[PDB]
């Protein structure tokens, strides 16, 4: 009798139960830092299991932090719109222009005609291309720009699968989403400028250790490319096994010819390229080049033109500058010339197709991280990590790597690395084991945020495309994170200590 | 030829021309004040001319200020989201819950049954209800909540007239109702500190800059705002009913063959709605809980160690998020929470949020660039003119420049300029700040002036010339009434003639 009533209203009952069961944490402990811990636990629990919509959960910090007195409501609101949101708006303008004029369909059909009919090679090509392109621009930018093309490819293959005559389509869409999202292994690990975490680490190391000049482009790549490539290959294998099937003999039929014929027929139906598509392609190229030319790290960029106000113009300035141009560039004339022209995209079309839910979710994650920093919660974890000097070096490395890769779960990678570096470096120098030996694994594992969205902006951008099953993302991310941690361990043990000389105390380290 | 190509591409050519022609100012002056002034001029020109979408123009500060070097892009992005947006989200949840479950039509039909079918009495009732709601709710939230109900009212009125007969008058009535809601929202907002974010910003600025002064509170603000608000509301109602429908003398005070038929058909519509059911009542309960907490918690008294941490936006979020988990319908056997995030997303004015954030960022860049100090220095020699002429000029300037920028942005821009000016002329700071704060809310000429105007104009019944014609008269009436109130009754209560002890010498 009552069992059915409990089963039907499981979400409401679970929400109430998890609010009340963690309630003793604030009242007990004299209300010191368990309030922010309780807020984080409740929000994370609601994020793991779909008790509430993800954006509704992201709005919870705006309730909990002000009432607990951790930080004022004005500051919590100010934390909801950040630089990433301007970047997202700028990129979404371009994405709307791409999809409205069927440029994505044309690119997808051309790519399918060229190579990649087999799903395994298609996924491998997506991962390799996204990983290579993310070497230079950013994780967020590349994950945002290459995702529409992959979605178009998958949609076109699904449409052509009819062959003049399902469960496979959605699982392939999830696999494509995850492989685009998880292609952070090359995008930032390999190059110092690839990710934010790697610029912050380099700046901190140079400031704290001016004598050591080993960290530069062409030396980060040497020790980081093998590990990142191994992670990429193993993650591709793991994703191809988890979703769909893996057969060794298949990678090592008339349906393929029928699909190729359908794809060719559709491509011919597209016809010659249009003016709007040409303009959109040119603006895409200009945006990508401007992102690449901000600060390559080996040659001066255009930021040297502004070499008086450093850090003022970020990637989002480029995104906005090239995206707002879509609202004023003429697309069609209303040759009657009745009233005026029309823009490439109108605000009506931009309001839709905009991931407002993703913006709210990332804002909520930012607010939660800021609330954790404001209270003595992150500092508490860092101070708990400090008294491990008596432990062996490898155990210290493993504990630090796991703690960093699990604390970047709910906080942005730059915030986690900026928090942990001042904590680890005195700990590294307390023992005589080569502070790089402990700094490298932590900064490598900080970017391994493959679990849940909002942890990494690429994850949220990919999550924006409707395949909102968090449990699948968690299942894939656990394996990818384990693979990444294992490969980082193997690299520290094998490849990195020859060139960085991580076994003995260096001269540049303080005595 | 050339002329036809210029005529078709008006907006593109105008945008390029305005960007290029004002470039001499930053190129020659080489000062941060000039660059901020250039950004202000470009944004204002695009807002009046509407060459670019209002949100697209609002995003221009985040592209211009970082490039000019005024402040980093991170600060500009941080300036786009404030407590007003949290309040807006919290109240849009409730508005979505009201509209989805057909509560707006029920309230509309009950109101029509109560106050008959005469358009002027309906307009009076709408203005009174909107003012009462905006006394506690923000003007944007008040408009978003109220406007669907009046849309239902007018749609039912034209339906009844068409069926009884079996139009231009109905279109005029819809225009008048939209304008009256848009104005009355702000008119009610002027009454209280929490009615508008403009009053909250002014109050916090006055408290921070003048800690010694403790005059401002709910009671004082109500005492010197209620008479002016009532007079302005009544005169604006008279102006609106004279403009569109035409004035009446005695037929207004005082059944017609069509009247009983319309009442009857409204009655059958009301029974066609059916008895009140679930997915309602709970909406009313949550709304009255929101209002009760709004005028009970903040009249606090429970969170004393943290004063000002929890505000009306916290209560709005607390009540609104309950619309995402309370079950509505059975069936996976998972229930329905009375709102799906898709429904909230297709109701939330994201463009309004971006526009207000852009205004906030532009104002913040205005203080950071130092342009506000330059404006205050240039306005300092106003001491020669009498105090009444000084306040008249200040109020006229504020109400003229509030038609382009949002009310909170305008007030937060002008407070750091006006407050030192009051101290310089050795005059009571309140004597200058209060009229300016009251006249800041008088933004009626354009949809960009305040978000309620944009919400009203979004329905497409109104057009810009009618809004301008009504807003000019309402603004004149408001300025005159505010000046009269300052001259007559506010001074005896506040002793504004003498220089206060809290103000620096
Ligand atoms: Na990257
Ligand atoms: Na993270
Ligand atoms: Na305004």
Swiss-Prot record, chain A:
It is found in: Apical cell membrane. The keyword Glycoprotein applies. It comes from the Eukaryota. Keywords: Cell membrane, Glycoprotein, Ion transport, Membrane, Sodium, Sodium transport, Sulfate transport, Symport, Transmembrane, Transmembrane helix, Transport. The chain crosses the membrane at residues 12-32, 40-60, 76-96, 107-127, 130-150, 175-195, 226-246, 278-298, 311-331, 387-407, 414-434, 435-455, 477-497. One of its GO terms (cellular component) is apical plasma membrane. It is a multi-pass membrane protein. One of its GO terms (molecular function) is monoatomic anion:sodium symporter activity. CDD domains: SLC13_permease (cd01115). One of its GO terms (biological process) is sulfate transmembrane transport. Belongs to the SLC13A/DASS transporter (TC 2.A.47) family. NADC subfamily. Sodium:sulfate symporter that mediates sulfate reabsorption in the kidney and small intestine. Can also mediate the transport of selenate and thiosulfate. This is Solute carrier family 13 member 1. The gene is SLC13A1.
